[PDB]
Amino acid sequence: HHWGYGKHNGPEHWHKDFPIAKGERQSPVDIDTHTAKYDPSLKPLSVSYDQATSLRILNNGHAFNVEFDDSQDKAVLKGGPLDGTYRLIQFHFHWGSLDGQGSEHTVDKKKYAAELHLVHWNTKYGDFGKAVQQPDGLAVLGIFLKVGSAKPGLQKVVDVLDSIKTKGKSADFTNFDPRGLLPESLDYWTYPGSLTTPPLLECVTWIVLKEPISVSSEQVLKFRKLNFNGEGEPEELMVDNWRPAQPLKNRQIKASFK
Numbered sequence: 001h002h003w004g005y006g007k008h009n010g011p012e013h014w015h016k017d018f019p020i021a022k023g024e025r026q027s028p029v030d031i032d033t034h035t036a037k038y039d040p041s042l043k044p045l046s047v048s049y050d051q052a053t054s055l056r057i058l059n060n061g062h063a064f065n066v067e068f069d070d071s072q073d074k075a076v077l078k079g080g081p082l083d084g085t086y087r088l089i090q091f092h093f094h095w096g097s098l099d100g101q102g103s104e105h106t107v108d109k110k111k112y113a114a115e116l117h118l119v120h121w122n123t124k125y126g127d128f129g130k131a132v133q134q135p136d137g138l139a140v141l142g143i144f145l146k147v148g149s150a151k152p153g154l155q156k157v158v159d160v161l162d163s164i165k166t167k168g169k170s171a172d173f174t175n176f177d178p179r180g181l182l183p184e185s186l187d188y189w190t191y192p193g194s195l196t197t198p199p200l201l202e203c204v205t206w207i208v209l210k211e212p213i214s215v216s217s218e219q220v221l222k223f224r225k226l227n228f229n230g231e232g233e234p235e236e237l238m239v240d241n242w243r244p245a246q247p248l249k250n251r252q253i254k255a256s257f258k
């Protein structure tokens with residue numbers, strides 16, 4: 001009886017195995033835009049993905065992960081609120097059964113159709129598994145998706161999904177350029193938080209872009225054909241794989257703009 005998003009093992013149950021679920025810096029959160037304060041000390045974000053080397057795409061039973069070679073310092077995130085440098089390890093999405101839900105963060109209670117998470121670990125801790133044990137171990141860049149015009153740079157991802165339908169399937173996925181998933185503006189909100197799935201560790205500096213990307217209805221429809229189950233098990237569509245907003249508690253959300 002492992003955790004998931006289903007009728008009986010979803011977010012409201014996670015605290016029994018992972019009591020940090022009720023902690024002081026859980027994610028996601030609602031971003032109340034009027035109260036977030038512009039911080040003139042914040043720096044432009046520096047996203048340097050020109051050497052990013054993707055390897056593989058994996059259906060892990062929760063989402064699909066596009067994995068990167070993180071053995072050389074390529075594909076790094078720095079600046080913004082961060083001290084030091086963070087190396088890209090993977091990206092994944094969260095999405096809904098319906099276009100009206102799917103994001104983890106919300107903006108004045110608005111839910112987007114989906115949310116992309118680009119996960120990076122702080123190189124001062126040597127690898128990902130040590131970084132997640134530190135309060136400044138990860139930086140996750142979050143990007144909202146709305147349904148409208150297709151995102152041309154997303155299509156290669158969409159088209160490989162039929163080959164990783166079920167939990168535990170992977171496929172080779174080289175030469176994918178994540179720059180094609182970025183919006184025009186790098187204006188952002190930032191706050192200290194957590195992983196949004198078990199083990200829910202409080203190790204993340206969140207950087208959530210204000211500008212959403214547009215993807216087409218057909219692109220997001222193909223996300224929703226994935227399955228949470230493994231091959232040869234009854235079909236459970238991979239939809240609604242998002243954790244709801246959690247209490248902000250003693251945190252401030254800062255804006256890079258305005």
Ligand SMILES: NS(=O)(=O)c1c2ccccc2cc2ccccc12
Binds near residue numbers: 062063065140194195
């Ligand atoms: N949302 S998260 O960044 O905490 C997260 C995941 C959430 C859903 C499914 C796959 C996920 C993969 C992650 C891998 C590394 C760090 C965070 C990850």
Ligand SMILES: [Zn+2]
Binds near residue numbers: 094117
């Ligand atoms: Zn995520």
